[PDB]
């Protein structure tokens, strides 16, 4: 039968479950922080050579796709897998939802222009909110593995030798990319036509004052300055400056017609301001850049939640990913089956992905947006037990977040590390890093390295 076969709605009734599950398979903790079926550290070693004879970039994909389930296969946390696709969490996950609308409205309301385009900052925060709430009024978190995370910094992070050159490459290149980063509408409005070069407009701001105290608190000209850097860009600054020099041009220009104590104190507050601007500008991209990580665990149960599927019909998502985690399809052909799929969470589901609809950086995309990769999120969630037969976990359905549930302790030799890293090799000798967007095993080893033992641990309060 297919009906969801992990009966549980609370710890003990899932201890309990737990329970006569591990008397009936052979869980381990040897290699992982929950228990799993990992009998052995993965050894991807071949995966290279493989990725180095490579004829067409279309095998490299499979290759790839290969190293990734030998690397997830048997790692995942069984009981926090269980517990996130129990019959209660499942009913509760989605239910929330349902009475919820109003809290994930800013990005919910615009998933069609999030799948496109950039998100505003607002919608960002709205989601990482909504997250630490769902969880929070759907009783999630069952322990550490589920909790949501305060701040954390290195105690100590072993890394076995034979990691240590490809380490340095993936940091280097981590922070190259960092680095590359950074480099009641009229004061929006004003600021807008401002910018272009328009500098007689300091003379009559629409409240008359350059220094107007501003609703925000600050200065109508910095916050509007900002808010515009937020639809325009940092480019503005530089044009706004620009403007300002014109503007110190003129008054020069007619200094005997001028007042010079008037043109210091207007000119002197143009930059006090614009820099303003930049430092929020700055702020922003430092919190839109801690608000990009997705939630794993809520984004999951957002898709489940607009492809319609309903407590009844989870099963069948759940042998879904299982058999996508055992068996790596290709995106071509999965889209297809979804396509095919009778049941009609299938093609909601794909009309969630923003694959080919992202205009932009995939690294500016918002968390809740769907994508034939943040597939392999939901599989994580669901697919490492197929729900209906969960005995069947034994066979093995590899999702890439299930090695965070590999162990990193130095004791154990940092299992987990070693085969992020070893995954990096098998990308880096067969595409080129400097080239991509996004590097998987430099966002897994990023959360590693900040401290996730499982995939599903929020980690917004971090940093």
Known sequence: A??????????????????????????????????????????????????????????????????????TKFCAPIYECAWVSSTGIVKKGLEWFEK???TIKSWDESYTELKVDVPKIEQLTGYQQAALKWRKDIGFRVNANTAALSNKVL???????????????????????????????????????????????????????????????????????????????????????????????????????????????????????????????????????????????????????????????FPTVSQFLFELGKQPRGTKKMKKALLSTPMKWGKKLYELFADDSFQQNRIY??????????????????????????DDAAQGSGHTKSILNLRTNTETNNPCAKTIVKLFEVQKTGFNIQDMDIVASEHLLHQSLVGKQSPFQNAYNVK
């Open 365 to 390: 995309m918002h968390p809740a947006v769907l994508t034939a990769g943040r597939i392999s999120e939901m599989g994580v969630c669901f697919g490492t037990i197929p729900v209906a037969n969960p």
């Open 100 to 102: 919820n609308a109003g």
């Open 155 to 313: 105690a100590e992070y072993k890394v076995p030798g034979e990691i240590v050159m490809s380490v340095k490459e993936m940091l280097s290149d981590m922070i190259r990319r960092r680095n590359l980063i950074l480099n009641s509408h009229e004061h929006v409005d004003w600021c807008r036509e401002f910018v272009k070069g328009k500098y007689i407009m300091a003379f009559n701001p629409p409240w008359g004052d350059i220094n107007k105290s501003g609703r925000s608190g600050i200065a109508l000209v910095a916050t509007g300055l900002a808010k515009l850097a937020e639809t325009e860009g940092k480019g503005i600054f530089d044009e706004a400056k620009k403007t300002v020099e014109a503007l110190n041009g003129y008054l020069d220009k007619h200094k005997d017609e001028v007042d010079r104590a008037s043109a210091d104190s207007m000119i002197t507050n143009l930059l006090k301001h614009i820099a303003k601007a930049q430092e929020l500008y700055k702020n922003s991209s430092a919190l839109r850049a801690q608000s990009a990580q997705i939630d794993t665990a809520f984004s999951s149960y957002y898709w489940l939640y607009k492809a319609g599927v309903t407590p009844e019909t």
């Open 2 to 71: 297919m009906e969801n076969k992990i009966e549980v709605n609370n710890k003990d009734e899932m201890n309990r479950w737990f329970e006569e599950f591990k008397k009936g398979n052979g869980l381990v903790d040897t290699f992982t922080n929950s228990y799993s079926f990992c009998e052995s550290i993965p050894n991807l070693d071949r995966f290279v050579f493989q990725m180095a004879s490579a004829t067409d970039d279309a095998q490299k994909d499979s290759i790839y796709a290969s190293a990734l389930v030998e690397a």
